[PDB]
Amino acid sequence: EEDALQMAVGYFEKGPIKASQNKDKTLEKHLKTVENVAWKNGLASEEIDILLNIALSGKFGNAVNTRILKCMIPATVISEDSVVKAVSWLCVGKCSGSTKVLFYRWLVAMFDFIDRKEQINLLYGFFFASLQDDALCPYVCHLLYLLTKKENVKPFRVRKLLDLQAKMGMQPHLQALLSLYKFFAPALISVIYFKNSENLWKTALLAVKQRNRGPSVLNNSLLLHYINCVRDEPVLLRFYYWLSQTLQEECIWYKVNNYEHGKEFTNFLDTIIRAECFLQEGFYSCEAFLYKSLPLWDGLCCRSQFLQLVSWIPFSSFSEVKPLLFDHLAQLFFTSTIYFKCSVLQSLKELLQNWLLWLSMDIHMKLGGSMNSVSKLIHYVGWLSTTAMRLESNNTFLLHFILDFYEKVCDIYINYNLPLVVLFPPGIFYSALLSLDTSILNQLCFIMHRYRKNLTAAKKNENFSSKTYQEFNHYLTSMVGCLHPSFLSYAVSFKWSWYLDYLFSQGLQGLKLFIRS
Amino acid sequence: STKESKNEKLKEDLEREQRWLDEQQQIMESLNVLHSELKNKVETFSESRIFNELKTKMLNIKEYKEKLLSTLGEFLEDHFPLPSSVNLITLHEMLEILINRLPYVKISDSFWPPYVELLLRNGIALRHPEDPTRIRLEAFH
Amino acid sequence: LEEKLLDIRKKRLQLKQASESKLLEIQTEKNKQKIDLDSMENSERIKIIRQNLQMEIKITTVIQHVFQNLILGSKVNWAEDPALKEIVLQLE
Amino acid sequence: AGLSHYVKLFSFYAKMPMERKALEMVEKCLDKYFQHLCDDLEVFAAHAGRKTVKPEDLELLMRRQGLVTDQVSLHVLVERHLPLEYRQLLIPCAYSGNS
Amino acid sequence: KRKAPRGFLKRVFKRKKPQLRLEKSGDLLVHLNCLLFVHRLAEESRTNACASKCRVINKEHVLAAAKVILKKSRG
């Protein structure tokens, strides 16, 4: 009926309203009641777009009465906008200025639904030259904002927009169009925003959407992949220079507020750390900033952020990185509480993982002088973590993080393919074996089992062979003979095999793995 | 309380690293197929063949120009001169020739004022900002 | 979780160094296209036809834009005509 | 009304801040301008012999202000100030049906 | 501001003179008359404010502006 009713309206269009026997409105009101259920099919929307506005009855109330609810059911097609580009033809009929305003309002509001926005984009100048009209400007500007592309920014259009701005007043629509043209080829420079009066039509547009449903580089993750794939100079040098001048200016910003600036710099350091974790190499401006700002650094000022930048450091020789960084992450390590000792042994635990990731590929990409650097890092942390339990009297919370570091030191050969199985210092292994809680005892036992596995694996493909095996057997005979108050407490909570099964069922995973040896 | 936080930041970082690895595999296959395609696709470009493509563009653009100008001869018969005052086509082409090598005069106020105010409203030509007895064709370049 | 994270990180580093190798190969292939550009800079007959293209499209971007402003202002009946339909919607 | 719209135009035509009591004086200035325009138009039309006033009776009054000249014709000034649809009705375009 | 009032201009024309027949687009042309009037007033007020070197337009500048603009704009 909807198609037949609009052909009936067309029959009214071929004759005068006085000569007609029936009302022109009532049929269109039945059509409006239909639109309240279903507005217009693509062909139906096309037809009611093309004829009802050119020259015929199309009363400025009746035409608008439709145009309010004339929106498409499926979408708008190319043939819809074609013959109504002959409605913007703007002549003896002209679809007069009130219905013209409604027309461009419809073109903005239903601009989300076009099968080919490219065809309308190729109709750019036709709407652009209609922008000279004062009544159409606030809506033609929005339409062109949704219509714009680089091929439509010819310099004569730029100077026409500037002439419109000079002749007319400063307007948010023109301001939006000019800022967008500046976003494109900058023939103009200028420094509201999708603000529509279609909010009343948006409720209708909301029903239409429901009906359709029923029928410089840090804050860019999609471009961060590009710089992840180029270790070029003109890309990591512009990045070095922005990053250094942002870690300096925003760090000087600390020296004036230090209270609210510690939430944007902290949230900027967090984005830096996230970008480094994604890109998987320490930015050359973040060790250059750490080397500058570590001696000045206190314990808690951006602790979780400074000690995540330490983890992302390019692999350097320990004789050249220890004095610059590890001599200040020990000056601070030994003078700060357990919550900085654990936040550095966690920092250097991730640093070891990052230095081993880039060293496994140095085996994949075809050593000895880089080998001695990760070995020295482990020995230095093992020196940090053996005197940390001296300052803190073998604090179990600190020992948990210490063995978390060596949790990634045992599993070097199996995991990172590096022949760098490096054992505990005696003061750490024996103070974990003689600890009082089972949650660090079984961690040490698991690390011993992983040391067994890695030494056996290193015996296969092949100093790591003589002294490491001697000290490891030293640790083995000490622990396997001792394998205990924490276990005493577990036994109080409670036939040697039954006791072992009770321990094993109570989460004793590392102990079970090492006993299975 | 800190090994639960480590496990939380481990699961969150595991999801984030899985997403990053998926996006890395995508730009791995895409980069490899782009290298394979561009290998012996744009590398097989001769300077002589490159100039031949520019000659094809010469003929295509010349035929597009002869299409636009043929339509400027056909459709502008709907316009048509009626009754010297110059024909609209001729005064428009005398605008175009003047801007073609430049001028800010272009018509020196060509006659039939409905015709000069025809090609002034739509953006075809412009008045001179100081002496408005002289015309310029909007500098479409 | 840490084992899976280590495996994912090793895969990602392998596909990062591999991607840098592939993108460096693509960039040096673009440099290889740059000497093809130098094969254009000989300028015995590429320059003249390039200048003719620039000086004739600028006439084809004028008559085109006096069709977006002449199939607009007049009594155009713009798209209700098969002839102007392929000449309106003018390609850039 | 019209004078209120005109002082709103004064805001973007003077491009420099104003005072409310000063725009109330621009109100009487606009009324005083019209008290001359309506009886200058009447006499310019009366010499023309027409009880109505036609556009060409007003380009002559434009020449009396002198802001229309041989260099800046009547059709020029409508271009620089009135909008497109507000300028379509005065100057004749050409569609073989020139307004 | 891009506006031009049809109705109030005709009402003012009828109020000041009860005997006239301002044509279909003669309202448009009297609106252009006052457009150029207000343009002249704005520019010459800028001029005489520069003469007084006042950064803000005031009563004394526009009072002198009236006796010049509305006198030459008079027919």
Residue numbers in the entry:
A (entry chain I): 62 to 252, 260 to 283, 365 to 515, 526 to 621, 631 to 651, 685 to 695, 715 to 737
B (entry chain K): 109 to 191, 205 to 223, 230 to 268
C (entry chain H): 150 to 241
D (entry chain T): 458 to 556
E (entry chain W): 14 to 88
From the study:
The CENP-A nucleosome (CENP-ANuc) is surrounded by a group of 16 proteins, the constitutive centromere-associated network (CCAN) and organized in various stable subcomplexes. Human CCAN is composed by five modules of CENP-C, CENP-LN, CENP-HIKM, CENP-OPQUR and CENP-TWSX. The arrangement of the four sub-complexes generates a b-shaped structure, in which CENP-OPQUR adopts an elongated shape to generate the arm, and CENP-LN, CENP-HIKM, and CENP-TWSX form the semi-circle. The CENP-LN sub-complex, located at the center of the ‘b’, functions as a node for coordination of the assembly of CCAN by contributing the contact sites, with the sub-complexes CENP-HIKM and CENP-OPQU on the opposite side.
We reconstituted a 16-subunit human CCAN complex assembled on CENP-ANuc wrapped with 147 bp of DNA using the Widom 601 sequence. Initial 3D classification and refinement resulted in an EM map with an overall resolution at 3.3 Å of CCAN complex, estimated by the gold-standard Fourier Shell Correlation method. Further classifications and reconstructions gave two maps with distinct features in an interior tunnel, representing the CCAN complex alone (apo-CCAN) and CCAN in complex with a fragment of DNA (CCAN-DNA). The 3.3 Å map was of high quality and was used for model building. The CENP-HIKM sub-complex is comprised of the HIKhead and HIKbase domains connected by the anti-parallel coiled-coil α-helices from CENP-H and CENP-K to form a V-shaped structure. CENP-M, which adopts a small GTPase-like fold, is located at a pocket on the surface of the HIKbase domain formed by the C-terminus of CENP-I, the N-termini of CENP-H and CENP-K, and the CENP-LN sub-complex. At the CENP-QU C-terminal, parallel α-helix bundles, extending in a hetero-dimeric coiled-coil, form the vertical line of “b” with CENP-OP and CENP-R at the top. Although we used a fragment of CENP-C containing amino acid residues 180–545 for reconstitution of CCAN on CENP-A nucleosome, most of this fragment of CENP-C is invisible in the cryo-EM map because of its intrinsic disorder. Assisted by AF2, residues 302–306 of CENP-C were assigned to the density associated with CENP-LN subcomplex in concordance with a previously identified CENP-LN binding motif, which supported the kinetochore recruitment of CENP-LN by CENP-C in vivo. The fragment includes residues 260–272 of CENP-C, which fit into the density proximal to CENP-HIKM subcomplex.
